[PDB]
Write a protein that binds this ligand. Structure first.
Ligand SMILES: CC(=O)SCCNC(=O)CCNC(=O)[C@H](O)C(C)(C)COP(=O)(O)OP(=O)(O)OC[C@H]1O[C@@H](n2cnc3c(N)ncnc32)[C@H](O)[C@@H]1OP(=O)(O)O
Ligand SMILES: C[C@H]1O[C@@H](n2cnc3c(N)ncnc32)[C@H](O)[C@@H]1O
Ligand code: MET
Ligand code: SF4
Ligand SMILES: [Mg+2]
Ligand SMILES: [Mg+2]
Ligand SMILES: [Mg+2]
Ligand SMILES: [Mg+2]
Lengths: 682, 307, 538
RNA sequence: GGCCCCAUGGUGUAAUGGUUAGCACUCUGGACUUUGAAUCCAGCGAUCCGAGUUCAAAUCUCGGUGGGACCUCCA
């Protein structure tokens, strides 16, 4: 605040882990460092800035590990220590200033489980003080210079609240706001603690004490407490941030002023996501991550609005190992693979279908398709070990998405299978389009451990072992023609396995090598990370850390080739960085467009357009189509990309001419995103 | 191994040669009770306190000496003399050993350097037979509102920390309340971890009261019932029913009888109450005798017939 | 209903207790419990935990010294928190094809979701299983239990159990250690060094960490890595001093490697604790006595602590197959008790015995030990034979105070010197000779000519342990009925600083310490260098 | 209101005038630096209240207090 008409000068204070506090000023586009303060080998844990009453001198309060608060005032052009306040006996985790009338208040919390309020005012005129017949606390006084005038200020403690058991993590006043022009300045305080609780405090006018008004939270369970708490503009809503990362939001009733109810808030993983799949009909997605959880997201349909929003409704796993891979078998059944030698199979209970058809707005009879019939009701945690047990939890109908207390307990899925046969932790899983086969791989350092295993989907037994490669298999893919299987490995090679033809209706077909690649024939100089098929089962694309995406083609003509004709059918491209994901749109255009979605280590997503030259020059096969912006991109490695292969809707009946194509992405930045692209442009 | 015989012989020679420094170091290192410095020969110790103080010349060592002094004699319970040819005993210690030691050493310390030896004088006052908390609190209060002259003085914060080290906070709070001085009470309550808006109204209410009634109220708040009844007695007649209620409640009949003269009617009332109390406890003959003394003749008949 | 009757009984009990405290008289708890339970018509008695869990705050502070439960949990001067790692395979599975012939459980076993050498039915195992092996949750849960008992958790020491911890990837070890330190302090750090700084400035002191490791994973690299973590104790399984046993059980190393690892660890400044196993195959009843006599008389072997684990046969192991085929038979119980008594009679006065038998539940054992109090039976047998045990654990003030009823009277200073692992060791102590009661101890060693650390080269003497026993006294507090904060520590350091200068001839003294100990030694006059607290002696 | 019988650890129960009351559930402590709750082994805890007769009473005579069986009375 000043009267030189500046470009909104700003003062900034920061504190870091190098035992120092720094001050900055920002005049327009120019910044400069006014001062630095050194605390020896201590640290500063909280900061707050404001101005002294009835003047324009900035003041600073710093809470330290010394269980002691420090006050600084800016006389002249530098900050100088004026006062030190004792009283606490543990670390301090938050301070805050507030202005009331012509006086200043300071609220302080600590790990002592206690909250203290101080008070700063302007000392008297060195006169009119004659009431010596009273008992008053000693005042902490300091003097400042302002325009060649001495001004004295005094600080004194106000009260000491209590009521918490564990640490108190944050404290905040209530912001001022304007109603019909007039500013209202309530007196309220909020605190959140580690013992799963939040307390709202207000003063009492009949006496000189403060009283609890609302105490919100869930006391009980192994879940830990809260880190942060925040008010609304006027105080209608209150928000809190939990230990894992869950968000809790409470709203107050209009007529009943001591009743609060929780509401719907965003949610997501609290660690790196590792895999992603789509609904076969396209109405939900399932994700797994290194946070040992599996989550399902589906849209919400409301009558009195037009926009559609997607929310979490299911969490069908809370596991004891880091999850790595997932695959889809039926519309309500999937396979998961984690940091162990065992693959697991999960199915869905009954109340999930009712909740799904209720929220998404479908019909219960039609979503069953009279094909699921009787099935278990829920799941629960077993007494010992890691598994899922049917509860044939509690019948709880829902018309709105749940909150982060019904998701944690009442939303599990039963386990119905368990497969052995691997010697080490799983690394990759895939499935064919005919819904009857399954692949697998594991970490290996020799040739006898890196072997693909094929299973069945009606009676789970090993079918045949495919021994090749000497290192881990990173990804596999089934051609849409259901007559091939491809593998890429850490040993910079690859292999293609062809299925032999027999009629033998009671038996099962077999696979054997059709083409391969050695050190010399390999073009990727480093680890291959991804591969994918063309929608017509003709070519296939590979992407590796060599910053190159290659097309290997002419895999068609399965009738009778001499041996093969497989080789490089394009030119290498230097994307710019390591490629960790490749995907191809499942849509065919008469102009023969093959669009590829390439992800990188830096979270960029580039859409190219590949065209077969059909001429002996290989130029004009790589064209750059579109690239993600700096706010639409990720921040760390991208681990998966998957278009919406809505095979159930073979042709889009109710669409705006299919103007848009949707796909989804996930990465190690704790984030899952859904992107949309214009059709006619590509 | 350090055999006790050789150590004790060397220590006795050192003590007889007036070389307290070496003996003190050896006893401190080997964990030998320090009382042997005095109990070996009290007359020589009390005759040469100055040399002791000069040779030890450390605040920490003197504080260690004070926190181990005890009334018992160790040359008869822990370290009996191997030779029974004691030269004499002579002067029996006149009073409490702790008192003589503390007074003599405090006098020497005050004579030599009031500023250098600050916490040790407070320790000498605290460690006496009767803890004189009032004097040390008053001295700390004096040191609070003063400026140093010699750059060896101790800040009031450090003195308060040392007092809180010797005695607990709440006990100091109660003693300060007993001192009838609100300055000391506020000083102690500053470092007490308490809500100011729980005891500020209490102290304000206590302040605006009559002096004797104030002292009675504070004493009752701190038990101390005899002082409370004395202060209440030194007041107006209208308070007498409450004084008598307290006398009957805690059975302070004898003290109340001592408080007033026998010619007073209050003495007669307290006597009647006391006699009724013995009637409750079946001391028929004594209470009847005391009824006859005061003048309750018919009650004397009743008690004498009953017994 | 019984519930409200129980609640009223509890409330009345605290009412009487607080009243008696207010007017200041002593009260007997058991009689009050019985009388008050009689009034309200109950068929049971109150529990101590329930009475503790209902006291008002100020009274909760004041009257714990009367309602404490299990006084042994802090009778040694510290509070112990045990945590476990993630399931994994032992490192020597690859180049041998299999693991030790007697180890139960593990990733590939019928004991589901259990760590190697454990079954999962153990107390600590069931605590980490429900926490899904997360260090933060385990530390918080255990500290909550310890506070609920009624103890003081000012001073803490960690114990990391599981398989071989130092064989895991570096990132996981970083994660684990920084989470332990953060759980104590309250910070949210990114790597080890930040967590160590903040824990140094913390108020809940971390005294030290203990890790179990194999002799082939104790080299210069691993020792330096553990030095940066804050570790101060090591546990190695020797199991035998005979070379044929170490290769017939597929152990994977040799005894000479064990001796060399002992030498390196002791020169670096750690403390060594050894696991030993009687009743091994091909070892009769006469080779055990010779084994332990050589253990405690040969300078190459003399450790600082011992763990006696008589051999147990458990299903799903090679020893189980040997036992079924009628080729291995265990000792008779009388012979086992006699052997344990004879072994305990040989322990030197500078060695501490931490545990005497395993803790596998009885129904899971096919043969071997069946009782559950081998130590006290052995002590009774020793009293019958006329011999006495003189280790460290059964001579300290707390144990002598709870098992017997004695208190020190005539404290003296004792010093013992010896040679071990190529070094000159000294052991200083304060103890009562007549009643045989220990109070405080310190260990000192002169660095040999084969030290590799940069901070300890050129004439440095290192202090390896300083300890004072009794009950726990919180920092900056004093209790005249306990033994800790009374000046026995600065007396033990002043003597260590005189030996290192006038006898060793050194010119510097170094101490390995935790973090609260870092502040303590800074108070004494030491400065910080690397992971050590050093001071010039010139 | 008389009218027959019952009463032992916190709870369910055993024992004949001796020269000193046994078991179960509950509770507390140790083996234990892997554990309040599991295992093994130790420990604390009672003849309601008065008179009494017999050398001697938890035990037999007569009492009050509660309880159980009969009708109460009574309003
Ligand atoms: C370095 C290591 O390897 S660990 C040391 C052993 N670990 C333990 O804490 C278990 C028991 N330890 C102890 O008994 C003590 O903590 C020791 C060994 C460090 C010192 O023993 P004591 O005889 O109690 O020390 P001494 O009485 O000489 O010192 C008391 C002072 O030390 C302080 N102190 C004790 N422990 C600590 C600590 N961890 N951090 C900071 N100060 C401490 C006390 O507050 C007291 O200071 P003050 O009274 O002046 O305010
Ligand atoms: C954790 C410690 O347990 C001991 N240990 C391992 N297996 C057995 C067994 N079958 N019986 C007894 N002790 C055993 C070893 O000494 C190991 O180091
Ligand atoms: C947990 S077993 C003891 C530690 C290590 N596995 C060893 O055998 O030495
Ligand atoms: S090294 Fe230890 S934990 Fe591993 S198998 Fe051998 S005994 Fe078991
Ligand atoms: Mg009964
Ligand atoms: Mg009976
Ligand atoms: Mg009977
Ligand atoms: Mg028990």
């Amino acid at each position: 605040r000043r009267t030189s008409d500046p470009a909104l000068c700003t003062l900034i204070v920061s504190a870091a882990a190098d035992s120092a506090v720094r001050l900055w000023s920002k005049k327009g586009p120019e910044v400069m460092c006014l001062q630095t303060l050194n605390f020896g080998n201590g640290f500063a844990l909280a900061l707050c800035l404001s101005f002294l009453p009835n003047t324009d001198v900035p003041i600073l309060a710093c809470g330290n590990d010394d269980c002691r608060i420090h006050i600084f005032a800016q006389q002249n052009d530098q900050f100088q220590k004026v006062l030190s306040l004792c009283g606490h006996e543990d670390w301090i985790r938050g301070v805050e200033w507030a202005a009331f009338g012509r006086d200043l208040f300071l609220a302080s919390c600590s790990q002592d489980c206690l909250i203290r309020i101080w008070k700063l005012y302007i000392k008297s005129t060195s006169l009119e003080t004659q009431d010596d017949d009273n008992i008053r606390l000693k005042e902490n006084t300091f003097t400042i210079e302002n325009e060649s005038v001495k001004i004295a200020f005094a600080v004194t403690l106000e009260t000491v609240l209590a009521g918490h058991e564990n640490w108190v993590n944050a404290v905040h006043w209530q912001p001022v706001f304007y109603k019909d022009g007039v500013l209202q300045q309530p007196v309220r305080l909020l605190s959140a603690s580690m013992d799963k609780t939040m307390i709202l405090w207000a003063p009492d006018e009949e006496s000189g004490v403060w009283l609890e008004q609302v105490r919100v939270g869930e006391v009980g369970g192994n879940t830990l407490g809260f880190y942060d708490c925040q008010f609304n503009e006027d105080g209608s809503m209150i928000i809190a941030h939990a230990f894992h990362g869950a968000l809790h939001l409470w709203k107050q009733n209009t007529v009943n002023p001591r009743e609060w109810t929780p509401e719907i808030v965003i949610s997501g993983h609290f660690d790196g996501v590792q895999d992603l799949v789509w609904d076969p009909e396209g109405e939900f997605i399932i994700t797994v991550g290194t946070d040992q959880t599996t989550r399902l997201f589906a849209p919400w349909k409301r009558k009195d609005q037009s926009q559609v929003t997607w929310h979490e409704i299911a969490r069908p796993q809370i596991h004891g190992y880091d999850l790595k891979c997932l695959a889809m078998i039926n519309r309500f059944q999937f396979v998961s693979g984690a940091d162990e030698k065992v693959l697991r199979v999960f199915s869905a209970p009954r109340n999930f279908v009712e909740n799904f058809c209720a929220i998404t707005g479908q019909s219960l009879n039609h979503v069953l398709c009279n094909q699921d019939s009787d099935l278990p009701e829920g799941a629960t945690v077993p007494a010992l070990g890691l598994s899922n047990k049917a509860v044939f939890f509690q019948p709880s109908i829902l018309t709105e998405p749940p909150t982060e207390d019904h998701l944690l307990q009442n939303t599990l899925w039963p386990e119905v299978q368990k497969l052995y046969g691997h010697g080490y932790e799983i690394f990759c899983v895939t499935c064919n389009s005919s819904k009857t086969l399954l692949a697998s791989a594991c970490k290996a350092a020799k040739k006898e451990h890196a072997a693909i295993i094929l299973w069945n989907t009606t009676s789970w037994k090993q079918v045949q072992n495919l021994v090749f490669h000497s290192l881990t298999v990173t990804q596999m893919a089934f051609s849409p023609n259901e007559k091939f299987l491809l593998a890429v490995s850490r040993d910079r090679t690859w292999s293609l396995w062809k299925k032999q033809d027999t009629i033998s209706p009671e038996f099962e077909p077999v696979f054997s090598l059709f083409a391969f690649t050695n050190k010399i024939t390999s073009v990727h100089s480093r680890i291959i990370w991804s591969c994918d098929w063309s929608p017509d089962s003709k070519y296939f694309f590979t992407g590796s850390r060599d910053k190159k995406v290659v097309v290997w083609g002419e895999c068609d003509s399965t009738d009778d080739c001499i041996e093969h004709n497989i080789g490089p059918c394009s030119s290498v491209l230097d994307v710019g960085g390591a490629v960790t994901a490749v995907s191809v749109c499942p849509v065919l255009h008469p102009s023969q467009r093959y669009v590829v979605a390439v992800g990188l280590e830096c979270g960029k997503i580039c859409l190219y357009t590949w065209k077969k030259t059909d001429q002996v020059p290989e130029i004009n096969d790589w064209t750059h189509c579109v690239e993600t912006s700096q706010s639409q991109s990720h921040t760390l490695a991208i681990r998966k990309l998957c278009w919406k292969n809505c095979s159930g809707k073979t042709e889009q009946k109710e669409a705006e001419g299919a103007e848009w194509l949707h796909f989804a992405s996930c990465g190690e930045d704790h984030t899952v995103k859904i992107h949309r692209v214009n059709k006619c442009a590509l | 191994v350090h055999h006790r015989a050789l150590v004790l012989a060397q220590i006795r020679k050192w003590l007889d040669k007036l070389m307290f420094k070496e003996a003190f170091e050896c006893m401190r290192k080997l964990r030998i009770n320090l009382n042997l410095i005095y109990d070996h020969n009290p007359k020589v110790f009390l005759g040469n306190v100055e040399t002791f103080i000069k040779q030890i010349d450390s605040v920490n060592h003197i504080n260690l000496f004070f926190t181990e002094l005890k009334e018992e004699d160790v040359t008869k319970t822990m370290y009996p003399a191997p030779v029974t040819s004691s030269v004499y005993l002579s002067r029996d210690p006149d009073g409490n050993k702790i008192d003589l030691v503390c007074d003599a050493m405090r006098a020497v310390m005050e004579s030599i350097n009031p500023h250098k030896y600050c916490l040790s004088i407070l320790t000498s006052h605290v460690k006496k037979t009767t803890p004189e908390l009032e004097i040390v609190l008053q001295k700390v209060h004096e040191l609070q509102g003063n400026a140093p002259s010699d750059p060896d003085a101790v800040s009031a914060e450090e003195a308060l920390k040392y007092l809180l080290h010797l005695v607990d906070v709440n006990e100091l709070y109660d003693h300060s309340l007993g001192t009838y001085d609100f300055d000391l009470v506020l000083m102690v309550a500053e470092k007490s971890q308490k809500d100011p808006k729980e005891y500020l109204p209490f102290l304000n209410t206590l302040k605006k009261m009559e002096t004797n009634y104030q002292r009675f109220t504070i004493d009752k708040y701190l038990k101390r019932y005899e002082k409370a009844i004395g202060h209440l007695s030194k007041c107006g007649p209208e308070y007498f029913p409450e004084c008598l209620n307290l006398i009957k409640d805690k059975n302070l009949y004898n003290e109340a009888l001592k408080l007033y003269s026998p010619s007073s009617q209050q003495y007669q009332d307290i006597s009647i109450a006391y006699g009724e109390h013995l009637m409750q406890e079946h001391m028929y003959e004594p209470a009847g005798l005391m009824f006859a003394r005061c003048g309750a003749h018919e009650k004397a008949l009743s008690a004498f017939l009953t017994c | 209903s019984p519930a409200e009757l129980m609640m009223l009984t509890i409330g009345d009990v605290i009412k009487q207790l607080i009243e008696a405290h207010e007017q200041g008289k002593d009260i007997d708890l058991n009689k009050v419990k019985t009388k008050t339970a009689a009034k309200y018509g109950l068929s049971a008695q109150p529990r101590l935990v329930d009475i503790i869990a209902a006291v008002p705050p100020q009274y909760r502070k004041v009257l714990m010294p009367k309602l404490k439960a299990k006084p042994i949990r802090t009778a040694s001067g510290i509070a112990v928190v045990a945590v476990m790692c993630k399931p994994h395979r032992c490192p020597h599975i690859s180049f041998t094809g299999n693991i030790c012939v007697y180890c139960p459980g593990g990733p590939d076993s019928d004991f589901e979701y259990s760590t190697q050498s454990y079954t999962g039915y153990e107390p600590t195992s069931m605590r980490a299983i429900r926490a899904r092996y997360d260090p933060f949750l385990q530390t918080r849960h255990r500290i909550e239990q310890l506070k609920q008992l009624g103890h003081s958790v000012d001073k803490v020491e960690f114990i990391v159990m599981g398989g071989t911890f130092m064989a895991l990837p570096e990132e996981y070890r970083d994660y684990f250690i920084r989470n332990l330190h953060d759980a104590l302090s309250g910070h949210t750090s990114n790597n080890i060094y930040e967590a160590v700084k903040y824990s140094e400035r913390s108020l809940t002191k971390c005294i030290g960490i203990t890790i179990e490791t194999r002799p082939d994973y104790c080299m210069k690299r691993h020792l330096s890595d553990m030095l940066t973590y804050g570790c101060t104790r090591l546990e190695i399984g020797v199991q035998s001093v005979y070379e044929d046993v170490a290769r017939d059980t597929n152990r994977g190393h040799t005894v000479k490697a064990v001796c060399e690892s002992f030498h390196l660890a002791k020169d670096s400044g750690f403390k060594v604790v050894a696991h030993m196993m009687p009743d091994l195959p091909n070892v009769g009843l006469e080779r055990d006595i010779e084994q332990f006599t050589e253990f405690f008389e040969n300078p190459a072997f003399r450790p600082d602590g011992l763990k006696l684990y008589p051999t147990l046969v458990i299903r799903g192991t090679g020893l189980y197959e040997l036992w079924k085929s009628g080729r291995y038979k265990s000792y008779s119980p009388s012979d086992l008790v006699e052997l344990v008594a004879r072994i305990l009679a040989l322990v030197p006065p500078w060695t501490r015995v931490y545990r005497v038998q395993r803790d596998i539940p009885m129904p899971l054992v096919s043969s071997g030990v069946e009782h559950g109090n081998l130590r006290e039976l052995a002590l009774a047998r020793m009293k019958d034979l006329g011999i006495q045990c003189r280790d460290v654990r059964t001579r300290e003030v707390g144990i002598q105070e709870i098992h017997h009823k004695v208190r020190p009277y005539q404290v003296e200073l004792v010093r013992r010197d010896y040679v071990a692992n190529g070094g000159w060791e000294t052991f200083l102590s304060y103890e009562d000779p007549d009643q045989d009661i220990l109070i405080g101890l310190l260990r000192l060693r002169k660095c040999s000519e084969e030290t590799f650390r940069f901070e300890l080269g050129g004439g440095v003497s290192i202090v390896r342990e300083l300890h004072v026993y009794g009950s726990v006294v919180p920092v900056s507090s004093r209790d005249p009925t306990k033994f800790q904060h009374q000046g026995f520590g600065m007396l033990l350091m002043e003597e260590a600083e005189r030996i290192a200068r006038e006898e060793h001839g050194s010119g510097k003294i170094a101490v390995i310490s935790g973090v609260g100990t870092r502040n303590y030694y800074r108070k004494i006059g030491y400065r910080l260098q690397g992971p050590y607290m050093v001071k010039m002696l010139k």
